[PDB]
Design a protein around this ligand. Structure first.
Ligand SMILES: COc1cc(N2CCN(C)CC2)c([N+](=O)[O-])cc1Nc1ncc(Cl)c(Nc2ccccc2P(C)(C)=O)n1
Length: 310
């Protein structure tokens, strides 16, 4: 068959884990900082428990089990893995705790400490992430700095799959009927024709690198998504960030070509940032770059990514 997804889907017990703090809430629901302690096993694993809402019909069309489906499949150092699922009325998605938050938040808080080695490496890690998804014929459809999580300052993972759509053997594009949308991140091709390819993902990767090099700005700030379509059409793009050479800028700008076959492929993006991250400062002029590189109760018997290899 066209790749029998012989993945596994683990079922867990709301008893063998304890919530500890709300990390956030949107319309979707709530994610809690949590502790998972599989019975028997002498391990305690830090987790995020993502609880959502029901409805009069939307609760029973795969409220998230779609997401649990895509995340149940992916295995890659730079993509969030779903540890398991919880079959309470509001099914819980159990996930590895990314203990440093979203990157968008992170770069803001630490601007005057982020180095160029760091920025370029998150650039390399996210392309590696996205390239895995392209391997698995997956289209993230919502790549942004907010949706990249921080495990360590030297290890990030792509993180939100509410909108992820797997392509079928004869599908070069997807066509999302509608809903709300993150306009200032989407390829022009998308913003007009609901068409999403891996290459519209590259457009998003572009805004993401931009978010990263502005230490967390908002793209087209001020401007309302209402007319992003219009300014983009006449030819405007996001500015060159002050820390960026032509080299880094010419890259983001390529991700924003109007012909999407004319944008870079993730496989190439990692080759390029890879090269930059060896001589980081030919490429990122960061003032003083040079002098630049939980609430744990009782732990002891703990683990994390290293249990997921059960
Ligand atoms: C250290 O604990 C966290 C804290 C923080 N915040 C909030 C508290 N303070 C402000 C610090 C910043 C974040 N966050 O979002 O910035 C993440 C983690 N860790 C984590 N691990 C796995 C996951 Cl799945 C997940 N999802 C998560 C958590 C909250 C909000 C939205 C999401 P999402 C859209 C990707 O589903 N979060």
């Amino acid at each position: 068959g066209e790749a029998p997804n012989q993945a596994l889907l683990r079922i867990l017990k709301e008893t063998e884990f304890k919530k500890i703090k709300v990390l956030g809430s949107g319309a979707f629901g709530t994610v809690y900082k949590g502790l998972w302690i599989p019975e028997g096993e002498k391990v305690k694993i830090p987790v995020a428990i993502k609880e959502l809402r029901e409805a009069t019909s939307p609760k029973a069309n795969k409220e998230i089990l779609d997401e649990a489906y895509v995340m149940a499949s992916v295995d890659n150092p730079h993509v969030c893995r779903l540890l398991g699922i919880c079959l309470t009325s509001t099914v819980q998605l159990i996930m590895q705790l990314m203990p440093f938050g979203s990157l968008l938040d992170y770069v803001r808080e630490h601007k005057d400490n982020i180095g160029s080695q760091y920025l370029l490496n998150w650039c390399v890690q996210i392309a590696k992430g996205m390239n895995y998804l392209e391997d698995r014929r997956l289209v993230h459809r919502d790549l942004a700095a907010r949706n990249v999580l921080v495990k360590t300052p030297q290890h990030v993972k792509i993180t939100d799959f509410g909108r992820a759509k797997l392509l079928g053997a004869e599908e070069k594009e997807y066509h999302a009927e509608g809903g709300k949308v993150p306009i200032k991140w989407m390829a022009l091709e998308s913003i007009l024709h609901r068409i999403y390819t891996h290459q519209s993902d590259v457009w998003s990767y572009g805004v993401t690198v931009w978010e990263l090099m502005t230490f967390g700005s908002k793209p087209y700030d001020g401007i309302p998504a209402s007319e992003i379509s219009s300014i983009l059409e006449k030819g405007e793009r996001l500015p060159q960030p002050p820390i960026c050479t032509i080299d880094v800028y010419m890259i983001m700008v390529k991700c924003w070509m109007i012909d999407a076959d004319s944008r870079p492929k993730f496989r190439e993006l990692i080759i390029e940032f890879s090269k930059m991250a060896r001589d980081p400062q030919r490429y990122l002029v960061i003032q003083g770059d040079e002098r630049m590189h939980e609430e744990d109760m009782d732990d002891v018997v703990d683990a994390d990514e290293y249990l997921i290899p059960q």
